[PDB]
Paper text:
By combining bioinformatic and phylogenetic analyses with structural approaches, we have discovered that the docking and dimerization (D/D) domain of the PKA regulatory subunit is an ancient and conserved protein fold. An archetypal function of this module is to interact with A-kinase-anchoring proteins (AKAPs) that facilitate compartmentalization of this key cell-signaling enzyme. The sperm autoantigenic protein 17 (SPA17) is a prototype of the type II or R2D2 subgroup that is conserved across metazoan phyla. In solution, SPA17 forms both homodimers and tetramers and displays a weak affinity for AKAP18.
Four copies of SPA17 are observed in the asymmetric unit of the crystal. The two central copies of SPA17 form the canonical four-helix bundle as previously observed in the homodimeric D/D domains of R1 and RII. Interestingly, the two conserved sequence regions flanking the central helices of SPA17 both adopt a regular β-strand conformation. A four-stranded β-sheet is formed from the amino-terminal β-strand of two SPA17 molecules and the carboxyl-terminal β-strands of two other SPA17 chains. The AKAP-binding site is, therefore, retained in the SPA17 homodimer, although it appears to be occluded by the β-sheet formed among the terminal strands of SPA17 protomers in the crystal.
Author numbering: 7 to 72
The structure:
Amino acid sequence: NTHLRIPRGFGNLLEGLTREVLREQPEDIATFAAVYFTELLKAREESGLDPAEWGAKLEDRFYNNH
């Protein structure tokens, strides 16, 4: 039997997938899971919650007049 310890929050991540699989009853669960994470990532991106990549291009812009 498998008993594993996982990072704080990963339980919730799996639970979100699981509850949506149960809600939708996909005929092909693995295909549904790939779509689930794709859409979750789009939602995270739109909210501004993508992790900051401080070595990556500072591609966004902020303006304020004085």
